[PDB]
Amino acid sequence: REVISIHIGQAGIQVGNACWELYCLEHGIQPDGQMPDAFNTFFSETGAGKHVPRCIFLDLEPTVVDEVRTGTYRQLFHPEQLISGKEDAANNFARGHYTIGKEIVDLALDRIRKLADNCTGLQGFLVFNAVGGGTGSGLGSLLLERLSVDYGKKSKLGFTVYPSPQVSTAVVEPYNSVLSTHSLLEHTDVAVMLDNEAIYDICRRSLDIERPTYTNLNRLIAQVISSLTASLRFDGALNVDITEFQTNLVPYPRIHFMLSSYAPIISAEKAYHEQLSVAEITNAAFEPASMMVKCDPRHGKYMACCLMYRGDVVPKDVNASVATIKTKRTIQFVDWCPTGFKCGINYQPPTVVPGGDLAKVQRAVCMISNSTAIGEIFSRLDHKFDLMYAKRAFVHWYVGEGMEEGEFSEAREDLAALEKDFEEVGA
Amino acid sequence: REVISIHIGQAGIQVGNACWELYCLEHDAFNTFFPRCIFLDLEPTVVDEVRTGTYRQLFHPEQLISGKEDAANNFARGHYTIGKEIVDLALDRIRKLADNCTGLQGFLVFNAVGGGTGSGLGSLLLERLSVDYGKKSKLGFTVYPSPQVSTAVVEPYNSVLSTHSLLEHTDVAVMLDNEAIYDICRRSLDIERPTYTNLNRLIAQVISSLTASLRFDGALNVDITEFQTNLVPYPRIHFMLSSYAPIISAEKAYHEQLSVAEITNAAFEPASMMVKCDPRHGKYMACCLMYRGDVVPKDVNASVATIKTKRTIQFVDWCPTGFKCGINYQPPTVVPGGDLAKVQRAVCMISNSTAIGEIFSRLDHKFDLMYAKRAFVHWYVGEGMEEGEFSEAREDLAALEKDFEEVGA
Amino acid sequence: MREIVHIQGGQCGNQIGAKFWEVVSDEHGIDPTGTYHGDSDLQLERINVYFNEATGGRYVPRAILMDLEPGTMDSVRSGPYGQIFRPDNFVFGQTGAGNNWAKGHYTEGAELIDSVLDVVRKEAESCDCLQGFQVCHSLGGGTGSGMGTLLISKIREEYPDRMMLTFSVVPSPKVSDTVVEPYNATLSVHQLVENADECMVLDNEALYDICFRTLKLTTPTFGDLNHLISAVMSGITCCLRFPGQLNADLRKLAVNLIPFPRLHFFMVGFTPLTSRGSQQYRALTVPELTQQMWDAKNMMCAADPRHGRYLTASALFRGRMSTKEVDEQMLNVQNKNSSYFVEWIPNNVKSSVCDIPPKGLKMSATFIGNSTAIQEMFKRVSEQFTAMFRRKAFLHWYTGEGMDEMEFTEAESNMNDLVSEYQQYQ
Amino acid sequence: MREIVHIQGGQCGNQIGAKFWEVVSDEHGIDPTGTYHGDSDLQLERINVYFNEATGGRYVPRAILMDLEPGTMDSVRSGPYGQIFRPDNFVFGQTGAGNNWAKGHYTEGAELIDSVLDVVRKEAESCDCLQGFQVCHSLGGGTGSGMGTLLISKIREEYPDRMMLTFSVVPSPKVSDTVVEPYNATLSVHQLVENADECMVLDNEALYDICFRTLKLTTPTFGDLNHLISAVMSGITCCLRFPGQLNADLRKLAVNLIPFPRLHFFMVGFTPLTSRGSQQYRALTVPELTQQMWDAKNMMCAADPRHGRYLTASALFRGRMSTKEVDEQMLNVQNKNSSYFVEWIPNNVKSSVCDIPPKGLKMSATFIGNSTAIQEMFKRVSEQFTAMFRRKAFLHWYTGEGMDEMEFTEAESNMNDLVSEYQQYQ
Amino acid sequence: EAQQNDIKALRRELELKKAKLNELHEDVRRKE
Ligand SMILES: Nc1nc2c(ncn2[C@@H]2O[C@H](COP(=O)(O)OP(=O)(O)OP(=O)(O)O)[C@@H](O)[C@H]2O)c(=O)[nH]1
Ligand SMILES: Nc1nc2c(ncn2[C@@H]2O[C@H](COP(=O)(O)OP(=O)(O)OP(=O)(O)O)[C@@H](O)[C@H]2O)c(=O)[nH]1
Ligand SMILES: Nc1nc2c(ncn2[C@@H]2O[C@H](COP(=O)(O)OP(=O)(O)O)[C@@H](O)[C@H]2O)c(=O)[nH]1
Ligand SMILES: Nc1nc2c(ncn2[C@@H]2O[C@H](COP(=O)(O)OP(=O)(O)O)[C@@H](O)[C@H]2O)c(=O)[nH]1
Ligand SMILES: [Mg+2]
């Protein structure tokens, strides 16, 4: 069994820099690539004692790629994997989807083919992108189009960064998010949202870090992915695979948008004075003070939830804890679904990396749920996208690249149709 | 068992200067080479660089033949005027090299057809070797001019006039371009500014990989007489595309996981051919795979199965068993200052197809355009030729084009 | 890979560019001789954008000096870092236009501009991937305005798909060096609105104001003004030369700040800029950079934005900073003073951070705001243009060279509809 | 092995040859006293191509000075590298022709040409494998043009298989020293088209123009012009004297650039040529050498090649370089500028690389383009020739010496049919 | 003197037209 991870854009490959850091520090591999069998899902073995990750970093701007070529992990990554363009899409979805995308995605495809050929029991792909940019949005959707026509039956775990409601860095990002979701809708099988303001609030309150940079954000994202692949990498008392989430969490082929959370995100000092058990982390995974997307599931209704458990966890209390959640009335599940949970326990605790701000915790929970509060975020995006589109601001850049007015209106009504779809399943 | 090597011209003996460096560095197994060589040229400048070089004492002084003055990119001059006085001395030595030998497998000739010495006296040497021995094999690894990358101007005249004798004299003819090799060094070896030295080093790798079966004991050995049957389905169709894998640098080699399955694939993509032609336009008539080093017969067997079941490339309708494998135990050696890293195993593929029918057709227009206006013809005619052999060499390549189109159907 | 060819025109362009090449070369650790003497390997990775290695550590700037009088050319080779320019890049006329836009655009331009074009072609094809061109000039003079603007038009019809920056100081009544300033400014702006991708408005009045209050200089010669302008130019293109947590290239800034193809006139400011008497009493955090950035008395134009409305704005930060702090400060200054921002565009501010500070400071910033208040300059200039042209003052020096009267009326109409069209989106 | 016998004629030939033997003697490391003093081994094994070992390490050049006035011989013997020739080789008449082609071709040559032939024969069979002869003369003067031309004809009668190089300067009306330039140049070309093997055309306009524009010399005396011409001649026969990755002798270049037997007039250029003030502001790469090579303002003839098409072209490179860059550069200029090249000939560029640079440089190049723009000068000459000959100006100075009217008509006929065949092949 | 100006203008126009022609030829080659 193998899974390969592709990274597109500035935010994508930065996230990868934290993930592969965490991976080698977990499996005891130095950054040069040699040990001083469970690593087979992510690293292929040269046979000379060197381990190479199954990943391809690609983007349109060579700046963020070439610090990676000269960091500590210069020798871990195979050179061909770290694809790099010559000029940026520059926060322009059309420029990444038709002008510059059309030259770079074909090189990525004939690369990713031999990664899959080296694999035997490929479980799927998992993609990392931020929709606010042009690279991660434009050629990301283009790459997903060509991936669906190539494989189809294989899972494509989309861990996307949506633009925050209020905290934003770009100004044309409403255009980019709407047009990108229009294709991310019918290509990604399972798409997980990761906002930025929510992670900002977690590091401010939980980690009690008052001055966080992007490093800490990417660090905890890797922690969630590690908690999600431990079931694939290691044996537990009750394991799930990546094909399990395809069935157990998305009731309709167009409702695939999950709210992620993780617990406990605790600094080095609270852990010393605080107690860890299964019941309280089962609680802490549901409160909105620990969610990764600025929305409130208290406003929505749950379809189905998923629960990753790591460390010294027995199965009797995960059942008792999820029972206590159902008997509470702050959160309610959809009428059509009497049972709304998918639980899982694995033996290996989360390892720590030196230099990170995550404590060594005895046990942890990674929750991945599906709800209807996600419908409020998409609607919130439509108000400010439609706000500017009527007066045709910033449209001239995209239409000058080779697009027209047609795709704005047709993409707009498609995501508008999705709004009505979410409201009718909730009833 | 021994095989002797002849080197003609500026390109021939520079290729040999790298090839013999590899042979001495690689080495009873030596008996097939230890040298049994002859350098010969009309310009003394490159031969006398060997005479004063590091390998002064290695070569017997007589071996290094050298004329008085160059043919100067003139096939007629190097075939009729100046060849006539040096070719007799050369072949009347090669004879006593063969009398030194007892179990001669064959001769192997190195020449570039663009020049006058490599082309003109190449064919002249070949004609007296064919009438003297006949049966003994003569492998000719020639260097044809590239379509778009080019150094001379009259080379179409030379290439056509040389080919007319390369058909019915050599037994097994391997094409090699310069643009294709330049692309190989740029793509795989990532050398953005290559010179002739790097080209000659990896040409020697191909030669060594096809004679290692005679020199060293493998799981499945293959002699020079074996290529004679297994790859030429017709007496006048012997022109072979070449390829090699893994052509790889020193750092990338350790990072990648070289194995038998993927290098059998990599030796089949047109991104790794030694001749600038696309075999997607053609159909493979036969393939030959030399495996060196750490090879068990199973994975080579499994690899040819996957190639046959793919549909990106096709075979002729005639050959269900369109392959010839060969396995040798000793891994390929490396040269200090060389760019190829040490590998447990390597593959040198020699195929035969109809893609070669494109290069001749491409060649025809360039020769045709110049000949119609009688450009440069006065140089060759005053040398001793006539308009007869220009037109008749032209129609010989026309026949070859129809021949490939007929057999490919 | 991403590359900027630099073009300096007229006397104003030559001094601005001279102090500019000293600042960049000192950032990359290249001494006046032109040889590398730095220490960090990071300084070598991104010298292809502005320089070419010649031989033995010799780095030559990718710049072209263009003027009409040799006084400026000799003043450039005399000063330090004067021996680094390639002498062939001193493309150069001999006669002189002399504050006559018609002489700068029709008579002397017609025989010098083929030469400057040929140098630019060699400089553009010498490199691989153009990011854009960078032109520094004035709008009052003749050899900078008319010739430089013709160069802009010629280049834009040659390479239409590449960006182009032009930094132009504009005349104002309080700093009135020549007499025909409006006749030059109005015709120059007419060509800039139809050719340049984006312009960065400057003026000498605001620069004098900055040197009085913020710098508290005793004797602000032109060296200090050129020093401020150079710091701005280095600050905006720092993203291409150094890596950072959030990189923002020139094209990324252009599409993020220009909502409509005719609205491309920006006002620029730079921080920190403090006097030596108060530089000791200061702190270096993100809020102190912002509230000195967004101050109206720090803009480098005499167009107070609170007399208008902000369309979009941008900040380019340099130094090891926390991106959360960057975004929350932009959020605070946009929520409090919500009236000063445009209403049908939320989150009007584009932000970026780079991880290499300039030498001598620990943390710096650079502000680029596209407000609508820039129309104060257009009305302020057009009335002086009208006041002479209603009565045909100074006209014959323009008329007798090839220009006719409908050129002035067309130029008046385009400037007048431009300030009208800024007012409508306001 | 391969042997080059040198023959110099007239004032122009003697002074050009003097500078030539200065630079060759320095290349082979021979002192002004005639003894070897070089450092590298490479400089010894190929001095027989230009020298003869006499006794005690005395290497004397294989040259023949030839003129009719003693001023040039004494000036040669006076200066350095003047005491290295054999005094028997200073074959020398006494009366002098003086810009009268008839004197140098029928009257005064009749008593000198016997002695030169005696010396050149004894000097030819002294070596084993002759490669060819190398002549340096003019086409405006009398004892250079007329006697040198007659010597060319007699030599081609005796040795019809051996090669022949002629570096000849032609007169142009912008630099017109004598009055009878057309009368001489027209008759001289009539003999050159049938006797020489190839002629590398030179002129003083391009030489003076080159030292003005590119070299930027202040006072370009004949020493510098003769220095440039000598550098060309060393570049054309560097392949024999030094080993390289691809060799190209005299015959090799001749067959690749002459597509028809009467089309053997070349244009020459040398690179790199840079001012002393800018020598350190540049790289030394193959693309830089190619940009300076294919510049039309760099030929050493006053005939713009962009006024016609190239039939063929040749580039001899010297230095440690990659052959791929050589072929890619030649292919690039062959595709982008497709109209300036002939169509029914692909590959109009022959290239070659030698491994030994000239002394003091890292990498050099020599260009020999056989273009069809050379026909302008023949028309540029024939129009002057007809202007005189329509009205028998100066004609009696030649008529009373042996030439009849049919000789001048024949010279016009050969000139006119030649310019038609260049026009035909364009 | 007039005809001389005509010569130096026609050649420059001819030169510009030849350069444009080369560009078109180059584009055809790349596009094919
Ligand atoms: N969570 C998280 N988001 C990031 C990080 N870095 C950048 N981003 C987000 O990425 C968005 C913009 O896209 P980028 O990835 O930076 O740029 P891009 O997607 O490659 O698009 P271009 O700028 O055109 O190349 C911003 O809105 C940020 O929120 C990071 O380290 N962590
Ligand atoms: N691969 C390779 N090809 C070479 C080398 N040297 C020359 N060539 C090829 O040889 C062709 C011309 O012939 P040369 O070998 O150079 O000269 P020649 O064959 O001896 O003929 P002459 O010049 O008359 O002596 C060119 O097209 C080159 O491609 C070399 O070192 N390696
Ligand atoms: N900032 C700055 N402005 C200058 C400098 N020198 C001249 N100027 C401006 O140039 C304007 C006059 O333009 P001028 O130099 O004559 O332009 P030119 O003749 O076209 O080159 C004046 O308004 C000055 O403010 C300088 O060194 N720095
Ligand atoms: N390059 C160069 N040209 C010269 C030199 N001396 C004379 N000439 C040219 O030769 C032409 C006159 O030739 P001349 O010396 O009278 O030839 P001669 O009388 O036959 O020896 C003039 O046009 C000069 O430009 C010289 O030393 N160098
Ligand atoms: Mg040769």
Author numbering:
A (entry chain A4): 2 to 37, 47 to 437
B (entry chain B4): 2 to 28, 47 to 53, 63 to 437
C (entry chain A5), D (entry chain B5): 1 to 426
E (entry chain X1): 119 to 150
Question: What text comes from the article?
Answer:
Here, we report a single-particle cryo-EM reconstruction of three-headed axonemal dynein natively bound to doublet microtubules.
To understand the unique subunit organization of axonemal dyneins and molecular mechanisms that regulate their function, we have determined a structure of the ODA complex in its microtubule-bound post-powerstroke state using single-particle cryo-EM. The three AAA+ domains of the ODA are stacked in parallel, with the motor domain of the γ-HC closest to the doublet microtubule surface but not in contact with it, and α-HC furthest away. Each dynein adopts an extended and slanted configuration on the doublet microtubule in which the motor domains of β-HC and γ-HC closely associate with the heavy chain tail domains and auxiliary subunits of the preceding (proximal) ODA. In our observed apo state, the γ-HC and β-HC motor domains make inter-dynein contacts with the proximal dynein and intra-dynein contacts with one another through their linker domains. The C-terminal region of the linker of the γ-HC motor domain contacts helical bundle 3 of the proximal copy of the γ-HC tail, whereas the same region of the β-HC linker interacts with IC2.
